[PDB]
């Protein structure tokens, strides 16, 4: 586990209806949620591929024996029961392992998004701890757009942040 | 000015099982098990089955008097026998390699 | 009267799911029979509202 979905981010956002991972921003010109479309799309593609692989990995009547072929009848019952047990075991194990791996994958996505946002602002923001960053300068909508897209400008706001720090 | 990183939540109440924990409520899930049927015998690829109602394969093959309804049978998708199919070899005796005949008639269309 | 691709002694199955727990004996293109009662594959996140 990466300690983000139930970790330092303690809850999910019902108001974020555009993706799986995203941001919530609070400026002087309004608030709102906005999903990270690249991460969500990559995750959707990978999970769809996972489901397809699971279903494509898998890819029948009874016989009659009279009273003098009880051994063959027991052999047939043994074969059927053994194959049934093996396939049931395989199905349950596959589902159980894949569910854990999928949940870990989503947690990793959230953690990596947090790290990429943190590596941009650097000294210009305070890490509150609950997944929020509090800027030391005036982040308008252009500043937020730059942080989301990945083209934030530390030299540009560094002086104001230094003054307010 | 604040910017927080978060994730999605919704009204879904579906649950999955994990090795470490059970009954995990998740946002989305797919079902891999079918537990529903229509409770009817039905045509396979448009071909009706051969229903030996009161007769069995012995009675139908030998032409039991209580099986005249089964004299006109050209093609079928599968053969259906009932649990209470008693009409068979009416005259007492032994059907030799009966199960072999049943096996050979399971590959016959 | 029907048009199905999978027939069991208990009834026909109209599904594309990989598994089933209806009946072992099948005729046609049928899903694999297992003794399980719940096979759900997770796609989305853990729901923490």
């Amino acid at each position: 586990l990466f300690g983000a979905i139930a970790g330092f981010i303690e809850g999910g956002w019902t108001g974020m209806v555009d993706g799986w991972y995203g941001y919530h921003h609070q400026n002087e010109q309004g608030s709102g949620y906005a999903a990270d479309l690249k991460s969500t799309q990559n995750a959707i593609d990978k999970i769809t591929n996972k489901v397809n692989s699971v279903i494509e990995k898998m890819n029948a009547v009874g016989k009659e024996f009279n009273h003098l072929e009880k051994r063959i009848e027991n052999l047939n019952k043994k074969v059927d029961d053994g194959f049934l047990d093996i396939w049931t075991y395989n199905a349950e194990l596959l589902v159980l392992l894949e569910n854990e791996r999928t949940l870990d994958y989503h947690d990793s996505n959230v953690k990596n998004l947090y790290e990429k946002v943190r590596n941009q602002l650097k000294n210009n923001a305070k890490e509150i701890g609950n997944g929020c960053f509090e800027f030391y300068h005036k982040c308008d909508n252009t500043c937020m757009e730059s942080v989301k897209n990945g083209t934030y400008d530390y030299p540009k706001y560094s002086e104001e942040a230094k003054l307010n720090r | 000015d604040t910017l927080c990183i978060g994730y999605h939540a919704n009204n879904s109440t579906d649950t999955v099982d994990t090795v470490l924990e059970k009954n995990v409520t998740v946002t989305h899930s797919v079902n891999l098990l079918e537990d529903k049927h229509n409770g009817k015998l039905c045509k396979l690829r448009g071909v009706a089955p051969l229903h030996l109602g009161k007769c069995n394969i012995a009675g139908w093959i030998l032409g039991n008097p209580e099986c005249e309804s089964l004299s006109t049978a050209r093609s079928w998708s599968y053969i259906v026998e009932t649990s209470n199919s008693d009409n068979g070899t009416c005259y007492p005796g032994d059907f030799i390699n009966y199960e072999e005949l049943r096996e050979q008639l399971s590959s016959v269309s | 009267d029907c048009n199905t691709t999978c027939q069991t002694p208990e009834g026909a199955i109209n599904t594309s799911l990989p598994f089933q727990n209806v009946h072992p004996i099948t005729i046609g293109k049928c899903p694999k029979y297992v003794k399980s009662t719940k096979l759900r594959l997770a796609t989305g996140l853990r729901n923490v509202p």
Partner: antibody
Amino acid sequence: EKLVESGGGLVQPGGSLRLSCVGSGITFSSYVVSWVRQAPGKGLEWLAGVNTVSSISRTDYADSVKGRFTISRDDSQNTAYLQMNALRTEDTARYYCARSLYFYSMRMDLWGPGV
Amino acid sequence: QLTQSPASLAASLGDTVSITCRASQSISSSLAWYQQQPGKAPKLLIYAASSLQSGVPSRFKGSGSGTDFTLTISGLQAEDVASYYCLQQNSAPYGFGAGTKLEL
């Protein structure tokens, strides 16, 4: 993966129709289904959209068909229904069902042939 | 909401073609470009205003953000003669562009 449309044809003006979009696969509850139409000589027009059963905004409609058209879903039968009422001559068009996955912001890259 | 500028175009083989879309309000890289041939279902070319759909030749490039977006076809071929549409996927009533017809 395929999507097939059915339930079209000739309608008297003032009548009603129900179009059906049936999906092939097992992951249909993940589909977010949109109905588009093209008039004979016009461009693509987005009409209605049905969203997943666990969402907040379940249905969306265009202003041109709001109150006349209704969108609905049946995940058990793998079908999305578009019920059109008070049909007009301007509704003569080819109808297409398209699908995005999980959200309306994702790719709408699986279209039906039309009807 | 969405205005597609040329609405008609005449380009020769091997030329460079630019089709621009302008939005009433910022939609933040939620614009997709589709190519439709007459009587056929639309085919997705560009999503997220810059991402190339799998199987689509690299002659197609999308670029834009906010209100202005452009689709550039470099090295026009004979199979690129069709209609092109822009889809916005941001606001609740979703919509297409008016349509641009590419001719020789």
